[PDB]
Amino acid sequence: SGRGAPLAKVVFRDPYKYRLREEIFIANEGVHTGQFIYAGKKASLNVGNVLPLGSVPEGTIVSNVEEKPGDRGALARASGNYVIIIGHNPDENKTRVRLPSGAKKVISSDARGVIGVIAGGGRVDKPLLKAGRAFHKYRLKRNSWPKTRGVAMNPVDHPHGGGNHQHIGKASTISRGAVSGQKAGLIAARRTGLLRGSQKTQ
Amino acid sequence: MRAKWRKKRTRRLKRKRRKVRARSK
């Protein structure tokens, strides 16, 4: 609930005790019930397994990627996302990858990831098409909806408050050095206006 | 005037009078 991606409950034996341990994964697209999941350095390059970014060749597609070895997954977890691996510097044993944002971060080759892309992709291409569908969306995330335009408020409630007409009355772009109670609008915006032209990271 | 320019001329002309009486449509 409140998530786009489905989850995969994955059961393993306890190496140190007669016991089962049931982890909770994010389901990469194409995983299925009853499937077998292999985890570790000397594991195979099958969508669903979880291998250190050392063990995989550039161009691999992984999800739930760790920022540090063993933090149990940080990157590329929202439905339909992934990170690509774009090369290894084995001497320092790093691995350089490209995240969903486009930004390219380098991290240890011991950090782990899950071969594949996360499930439930395409969720956002469907319009919500009524206020109620959004209301029910956010019922289960948080009290963020609906949103009142700061410019419909009196000045006591907002920097954009008041006026005999509805206008921001001053630049909507706010300095990073601004103070809490000031930072509303386009914070630290390096640019503004309708983005024209190819936007894919050069 | 050129033939295809006379074409653009009246394609435009018609778009405009199409408009002008969708106003009373």
Binding site: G30, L45, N46, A119, G122, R123 | -
Partner: protein, 91 residues
Amino acid sequence: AKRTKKVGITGKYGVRYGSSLRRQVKKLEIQQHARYDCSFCGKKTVKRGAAGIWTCSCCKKTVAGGAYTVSTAAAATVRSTIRRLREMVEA
């Protein structure tokens, strides 16, 4: 007789929200409702619930999928290039 010339399933929304929004909904609607074919048993018995969860009526098998189709283009073009990279590490 044919019941609607263009709205299809999207007639439930009546006249509201504008043709463009309704049309683009209809597309994904048809996707997420239709029965698909099961890869493990070969009948068309896999239907959606809880988008990205696709389950086979008989044989009780479930598969993570796209939000409104079983396999999304991206996934499939990953599957392909994960095979490719795999076959390149035994020979």
